[PDB]
Amino acid sequence: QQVLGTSARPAVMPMDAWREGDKFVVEFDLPGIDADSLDIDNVVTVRAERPAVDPNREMLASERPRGVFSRQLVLDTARIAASYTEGVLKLQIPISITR
Amino acid sequence: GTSARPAVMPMDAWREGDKFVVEFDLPGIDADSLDIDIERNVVTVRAERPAVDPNREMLSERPRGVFSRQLVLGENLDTARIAASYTEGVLKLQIPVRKISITR
Amino acid sequence: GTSARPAVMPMDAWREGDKFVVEFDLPGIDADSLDIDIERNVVTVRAERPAVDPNREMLASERPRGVFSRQLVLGENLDTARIAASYTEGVLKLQIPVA
Amino acid sequence: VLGTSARPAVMPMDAWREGDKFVVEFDLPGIDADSLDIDIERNVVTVRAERPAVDPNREMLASERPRGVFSRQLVLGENLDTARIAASYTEGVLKLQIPVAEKAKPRKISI
Amino acid sequence: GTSARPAVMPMDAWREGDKFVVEFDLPGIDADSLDIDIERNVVTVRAERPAVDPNREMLASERPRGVFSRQLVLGENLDTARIAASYTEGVLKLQIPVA
Amino acid sequence: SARPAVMPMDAWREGDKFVVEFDLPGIDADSLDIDIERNVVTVRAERNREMLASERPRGVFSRQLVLGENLDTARIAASYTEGVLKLQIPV
Amino acid sequence: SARPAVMPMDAWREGDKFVVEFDLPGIDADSLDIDIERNVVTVRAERAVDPNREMLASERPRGVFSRQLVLGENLDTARIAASYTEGVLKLQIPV
Amino acid sequence: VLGTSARPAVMPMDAWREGDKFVVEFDLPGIDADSLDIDIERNVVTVRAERPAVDPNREMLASERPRGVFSRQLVLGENLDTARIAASYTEGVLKLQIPVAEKAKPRKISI
Amino acid sequence: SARPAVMPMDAWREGDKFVVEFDLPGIDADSLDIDIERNVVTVRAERNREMLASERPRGVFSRQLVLGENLDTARIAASYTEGVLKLQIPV
Amino acid sequence: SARPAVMPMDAWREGDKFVVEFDLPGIDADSLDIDIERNVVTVRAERAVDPNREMLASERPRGVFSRQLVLGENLDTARIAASYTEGVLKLQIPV
Amino acid sequence: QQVLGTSARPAVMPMDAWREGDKFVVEFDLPGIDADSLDIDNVVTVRAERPAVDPNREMLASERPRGVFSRQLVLDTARIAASYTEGVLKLQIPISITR
Amino acid sequence: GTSARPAVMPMDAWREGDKFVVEFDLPGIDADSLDIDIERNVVTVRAERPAVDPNREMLSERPRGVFSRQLVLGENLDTARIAASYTEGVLKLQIPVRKISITR
């Protein structure tokens, strides 16, 4: 808690990247992110913007990550299938010598 | 976190006029494991994220297991007309609802 | 600590006969920011201490400031009506009779 | 480290819910019943025990066992029967069994 | 903190025109234990807060107690004679004119 | 049993009898094993259900005691009462 | 295999051969696998004790050990020479 | 992290004593002289500089450089000449040279 | 030079020019070496006397920058002013 | 040599031979020395890079490695059998 | 600092043990220990007792180890030469197979 | 600790009537390295413990190197008649030597 991401200094996101029988799928945990201003633009960069809590509004519990969230991915980058379901950004991308 | 020793989940609890709202973050949760079974005293939210696919070894940074949270509040909120919503991997809970002398 | 994420405050609680005494430390607090919100059986103590100007150059900044809050879960033994509160020497002594 | 009456030290506990009996277990090895006091009403169940301290002048070889006042505050819901509580002390283990009084119709929340 | 090994106290120092102000936080302190010992150019602030009875059973012990001390090395700009000290709301505001 | 956890122990010299005390609350005597040979005493003990709390430590507990030549290792008295394993070895 | 442990390696540039050494103490060669991409070279190896064999002390790190080495374009990727001597995997890559 | 005017951040410094000149060095890369203020009397030498902050709305790729108010309080003995101090700023390095005014007869303590 | 320390750096995209800034105060230009080949930029710099204080970090400082295919690696501008190594690479 | 680093070892009791294994990746045998006392056995070995050979990355632990093993009286101290295979120093002590 | 040794729970002492051309000498750092009640009694145990500071006496600096100091040494134990000089307890005591 | 970056040494400074006493702990210190050279403003105590014998490798828990300590006090103590003693590895230093309104 109290660890947010400035627009200049963002916060990294969790993700599980695995290869199935013939797919290369990454899954980024992205809950409560409804802003279509999130930009998943050699490398694939995933960016999202979750709003910040009002300091004047007195909430008795403020324990959740908010702000700017980003993650760069060094890796066919043309036909990728992105799907947002249940708050999960699912991105689907396609020696025996010795001495 | 296992069932015996559960892990804590994030939440934000704020009072919004007529409705007190507390929101948990449970992304990609299957409903067969999400259970908030409790009585009138407290409000316990339990949920289970499945372990990694045993046949699918990956190159694994997302937390999984059992996440639980106990909310101890007063007798004010009516526990009968509670409203729950699971949207965008968010568990939004909406529960509806003198002074003392100028200190010496 | 801001109003969203408050910083806790110290307190000493002891049962003195038929008078359960709690003691909070609030040195130098204006009464307009002090708010003792009480509900069914929980006593919520909130107070606001002003913040330092970031541009004002002070040689030492060691005193904690901001929003200080503390929730008190009380059993059904103390009467939430009759209560006596005092503020002496920057001390918030609350006194709740019991049964 | 060491728990005093004003600042008590926490004690280990294992709590599990049997079908008919809700069980809590506290680890209190070598405790005298004269100091062991489960004094509380039917609201919050607080276990307070006291283990005597060591003489600062006595010269022991190894002082590794924790001593002093141990206390644990347990907040229970409205499901446990308060009067018919059972308590036992076996092999330095304080086993407490509390029956559960469940309601006829439970609540299932819609989403 | 005991008298041999004292625990430090918070303070805020700022130069207000010809009045250098220091502010110590001493909530609930009896004046018989407060001792402001001054020497050549060093201002030593000492205060004693009583300790809790170890045998008295209190449900919460969170407030720091014992001997609180603080040494202040001051330059040759402030007059060590004319000084004005106040204790309001558990606050020890010392005010030393300058040159 | 490969990586054991350590157990608390208070030892003092009571005149003719040197006494060591271990805290083993709620231990089955079938698992309590005290293996000693020559001048070293080895104390070994052994102790997903949606539990409300699981604060008590469990598993294999062990303690390795290197003793001097001042105590007779053959005549050693041991008792287990109130969850305490008290061992007294004369001088 | 999913979450591997890192290996100790040291790389120095010989006059004509850049040499990187890995510490692989007692890894069965059937588990040793050197999979190299275009300009990166990944060294993987597997080395766990069976629970029915009760050990008095287990301190050696076991499991999956891996390392992903990002190399420059100045090294030829075809004629690399590896050896496994005294539990050291000596990789010698010419230039 | 970030130093403000009320809570300033410390700055690195290397101080060594030459035979004739006592030298102190501060690391202030990319500092504007309008904010750099060595304002103090002949008692304690305090170096106070200010580096502008970053716009919270501007989207940078990496924000790793420390910014804000940097301050350093230096307590010196009665050996340094106060008036004839030399100050320079070269390659983001604040080099300060202060002559030393030693006494004729020094003290050697007996034990 | 085997185990180098990392240096601070602020990078941002200024329209046609992507600018990265390193803090190298009081560095000799003979030791400042910027080795770059293909799409990776490597920045390397090098910086008992009874001193009163030795708070300034010294030794070998290095930084490894992995860049994308969006910038031309041949035409890169560099400057060293006020102890700051500013490198601007066009898009 | 004065302050040595510890070694990873694992010991298990075979049916008739208690075996303890050490990880010694690429230690020249001239520096390997096994000095055993009455009932204790001390394994010492030496493995440092020269400064004139500039390395791009140095991560392998080097220097003096040692281990003092306190054994019981149930092991015969005369007919021990040691091997150094795949950088593993396998000590086999009968009973 | 503030780390002392109870008579029951003592504090360990530093020592340098080395073998010369024909000696086995251990050197224990023991400054300001003048009590002859210090007892250096298969194993050699070194014990010493340094007095404790008075809590009532207000000292402005109390940063040094005091109290009970002990150290056990597992090792001809008959003719040993002990010497205390400059606050230093100097104790002087006298396979090529593979596969 | 080296000469550039020295290590701190323990001490106890208490006011004993006519004499203010501050004691340092320097066990087994050779006098050729112990030097407390300072002026009237502060009191700086420096001492150097020799590094381990290069020809004598041991099986080394005693700290060595350069230990220094700076004592900043007021102008009260007379810096002329200071008394120093080195006994039992202890450096005992003996230096000889209005109110304000009841706070509002």
Q: Explain this structure to me?
A:
- It is classed as chaperone.
- The entry lists the keywords sHSP, oligomers, polydispersity, chaperone.
- It forms a dodecameric assembly.
- Small heat shock protein from Mycobacterium marinum M : Form-3.
- Chains A and 11 copies: Small heat shock protein.
- By secondary structure, the first copy, chain A, is mainly β.
- Chain A has one domain.
- Helices cover 0% and strands 40% of the residues of chain A.
- Chain A contains no helices and 7 strands.
- A 4-stranded antiparallel sheet of chain A has the order 2-3-7-6, with no helix packed on it. Chain A has a 3-stranded mixed sheet with strand order 1-5-4, with no helix packed on it.
- The first copy, chain A, is elongated.
- The G-J interface holds G 8-13, 21, 23-27, 49, 53-61, 84-88 and J 8-13, 21, 23-27, 49, 53-61, 84-88.
Features:
four-stranded antiparallel sheet; mainly beta; stress response (chains D, H); Molecular chaperone (Small heat shock protein) (chains D, H); elongated; 99 residues; homododecamer
How widely separated are the two ends of chain A?
A: 54 Å
Number of domains of chain A: 1
Oligomer: homododecamer
How big is the Rg of chain A?
17 Å
Classification by helices and strands of chain A: mainly beta
Strand/helix succession of chain A: EEEEEEE
Reported for the largest beta sheet of chain A, the result is:
4 strands, antiparallel
Count helical runs of chain A: 0
Taken as a percent bin, the fraction of beta residues of chain A is: 35-45%
- Helix percent band of chain A: under 10%
The total beta strand count of chain A reads 7
Shape of chain A: elongated
Q: Quick one: which chains have the greatest interface?
A: G-J, 27 and 27 residues
